[PDB]
């Protein structure tokens, strides 16, 4: 009977909420009310990079902290050196509408995807010295939003057909499918130890997944509209989310609920990208009013503004040693800040 | 040095090739095609030629008077469209195709047009509006079994504008009906009263051989308006 099942679901949800309320004895503000502020944080552009002909959708830093990749809505994928502002590679694409990029931890491969529902894996170290397409992965029933490597042989993807997948590159086939969302899936982030990951999915819900088994572990709620970005805290025990209600929030995985919210009364636009700093004290967010903001993760205050762009800001990244911060917008320029 | 010269050489070669690509990119006009299941955008695509499973997008290319056109159709996607529709904020024009022989699938078309008009990322984009299935409308109106007044009451108080330009050899009833249907869309278009983009309406059929020329002329007007606005002469 449908009604009996729905009533049982409602009862279980009430039990969940009562157990969750019973586990909150204090707030983050009260504990963190006896520390020192970080003060005004000022940054300047050190390098500016040119060459694209249309808007940019994604960037990704390398593991040596010197090279980076970038993808634009005109069918090109460029690999740059940021110490000298040179160009090391330029690759043309087959479909221009591209929405994601990734850079393998060993420096050998790159990947991309978009509105053609296909993931393309490119080789960068051929014997002849020329870039050629090494593999194409097909089987999704909607466009691809993000993709991130694990090693040179395994890769995880998320699409707007409500599902996520894990792929074996050499054979060419799927190996585990993650299903259970309701709307589209917009972002994902991998754990530092590469045994779990988190997904945000455009129905005001977030989920944590276990790679080696294929089931869900926890779900978190609290936002009021679509979730657009996600990332892990450096120790793998927290994560931050941003949405289109103009709010960021922080979630913890052991207490299983929400701790702190970042908002203001003058902010009436959405959020496009989030990222942490090396120690976990600075949280950097990108907005649709042409500039980026810098928050303090324990006091819930604002500490800085980065404001040099002309159009919507779309991508943001911090290196693996803390040195530089790179941002990219819809006017076809990247910028590097320190 | 002796290992930095090669880097500058590679950068110079890459920049040369990028210039040759920019020339070709900045001389092609990009259009987006939108419609519904009962419309005939498949037939319009098939007639615009000489003038992998689970594939997500389709492309078609044609040439009018030595100007190149690219036109994009959306294939295997879900029903919701509030995320990918933003990838089209810089096309020259949208082409909205509507069937006009239903009387009960027209309100949905009106709502979809009204939703495209008022979005934040598509307020500088112009629309070319096609109304297929004119023979069916003519037959259905002359037959007289179905009445438009059951869905739109205001048709009970409508008269053809005296300055109308009816086609020769046409019953006045068909003129009344089709002018009413056109007025609905034009009223939605001019309701905002902003003046930064325009609607261009037309009447077409299943086997007609003039659509590409219509698109040509309308795109010409769009680009002229853009140029004049660049010079502050508006």
């Amino acid at each position: 009977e449908l009604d009996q099942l729905r009533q049982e679901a409602e009862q279980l949800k009430n039990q969940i909420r009562d157990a969750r309320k019973a586990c909150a004895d204090a707030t983050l503000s009260q504990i963190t009310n006896n520390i020192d502020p970080v003060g005004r944080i000022q940054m300047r552009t050190r390098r500016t990079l040119r060459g694209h002909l249309a808007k940019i959708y994604a960037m990704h830093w390398g593991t040596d902290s010197r090279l980076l990749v970038s993808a634009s809505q005109d069918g090109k994928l460029i690999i740059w050196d940021s110490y000298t502002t040179n160009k090391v590679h330029a690759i043309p694409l087959r479909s221009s509408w591209v929405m994601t990029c990734a850079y393998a931890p060993s420096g050998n491969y790159v990947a991309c995807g978009g509105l053609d529902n296909i993931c393309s894996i490119y080789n960068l170290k051929t014997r002849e010295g020329n870039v050629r397409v090494s593999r194409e992965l097909a089987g999704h029933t909607g466009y691809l939003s993000c993709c991130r490597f694990l090693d040179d042989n395994q890769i995880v993807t998320s699409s707007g057909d409500t599902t996520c997948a894990l792929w074996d590159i050499e054979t060419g086939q799927q190996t585990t499918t993650f299903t259970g969302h309701t709307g589209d899936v917009m972002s994902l982030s991998l754990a530092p130890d590469t045994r779990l990951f988190v997904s945000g999915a455009c129905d005001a819900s977030a989920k944590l997944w276990d790679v080696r088994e294929g089931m869900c572990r926890q779900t978190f709620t609290g936002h009021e509209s679509d979730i657009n970005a996600i990332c892990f805290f450096p120790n793998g025990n927290a994560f931050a989310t941003g949405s289109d209600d103009a709010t960021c929030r922080l979630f913890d995985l052991r207490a299983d609920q929400e701790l702190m919210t970042y908002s203001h009364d003058n902010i009436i636009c959405g959020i496009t990208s989030v990222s942490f700093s090396k120690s976990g004290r600075l949280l950097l967010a990108g907005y649709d009013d042409f500039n980026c903001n810098v928050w303090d993760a324990l006091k819930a205050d604002r500490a800085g503004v980065l404001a040099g762009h002309d159009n919507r800001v779309s991508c943001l990244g911090v290196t693996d040693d803390g040195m530089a911060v790179a941002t990219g917008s819809w006017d076809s320029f990247l910028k590097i800040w320190n | 040095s002796a290992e930095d010269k090669a880097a500058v050489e590679r950068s110079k070669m890459i920049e040369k090739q990028l210039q040759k690509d920019k020339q070709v990119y900045r001389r092609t006009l990009r259009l987006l095609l939108l419609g519904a299941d009962n419309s005939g955008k498949s037939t319009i695509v098939k007639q615009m030629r000489i003038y992998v499973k689970t594939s997500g997008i389709f492309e078609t290319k044609f040439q009018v008077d030595k100007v190149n056109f690219h036109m994009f159709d959306v294939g295997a996607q879900r029903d919701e469209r509030r995320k990918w529709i933003q990838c089209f904020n810089d096309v020259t024009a949208i082409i909205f195709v509507v069937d006009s022989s239903d009387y009960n699938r027209l309100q949905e078309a009106l709502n979809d047009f009204k939703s495209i008009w008022n979005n934040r990322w598509l307020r500088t984009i112009s629309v070319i509006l096609f109304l297929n299935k004119q023979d069916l409308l003519a037959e259905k109106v002359l037959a007289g079994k179905s009445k438009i007044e059951d869905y739109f009451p205001e048709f009970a108080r409508y008269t053809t504008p005296e300055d109308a330009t009816p086609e020769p050899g046409e019953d006045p009833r068909v003129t009344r009906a089709k002018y009413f249907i056109r007025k609905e869309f034009v009223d939605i278009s001019t309701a905002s009263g902003d003046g930064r983009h325009i609607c261009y309406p037309h009447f077409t059929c299943s086997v007609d051989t003039e659509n590409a020329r219509r698109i040509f002329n309308d795109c010409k007007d769009i680009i002229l308006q853009m140029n004049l606005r660049e010079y502050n002469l508006v």
Epitope: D203, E224, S225, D245 | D79
Partner: nanobody, 128 residues
């Protein structure tokens, strides 16, 4: 969590009148635009009426003009619809709908593909 819940419905003779109410929980009420939709046996999802944040802009469909009225209370977080002079062609299931974003004037909220911010619905039957 986002919750929309409906109340009022049932069986009415032709020529009757009735009133449908909807209660909302989990978001700021006044930053949003709201709509009514309905499902008839053997058809798709239609559109009936819509109202804006303050209440000064209202819009209807062709076949309900002169019979239905839309109302919005912000202090008590409620959406109302008043139904007069029913017909047999109104028997259906009725849902309320919220737009996906705040501070905006467009919608994309009739889809069947399990649109998230929609209620469960109430049944109205008009027969003798």
């Amino acid at each position: 969590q986002v919750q929309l819940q409906e109340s009022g419905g049932g069986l009415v003779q032709p020529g009757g009148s009735l009133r449908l109410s909807c209660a909302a929980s989990g978001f700021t009420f006044s930053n949003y635009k709201m709509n009514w939709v309905r499902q008839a046996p053997g058809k798709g999802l239609e559109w009936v009426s819509d109202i804006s944040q303050s209440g000064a802009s209202i819009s209807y469909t062709g076949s309900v003009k002169g019979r239905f009225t839309i109302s919005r209370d912000n202090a008590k977080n409620t959406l109302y619809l008043q139904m007069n002079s029913l017909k047999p062609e109104d028997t259906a299931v009725y849902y309320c709908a919220r737009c996906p974003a705040p501070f905006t004037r467009d919608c994309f909220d009739v889809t069947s593909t399990t649109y998230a911010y929609r209620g469960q619905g109430t049944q109205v039957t008009v027969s003798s």
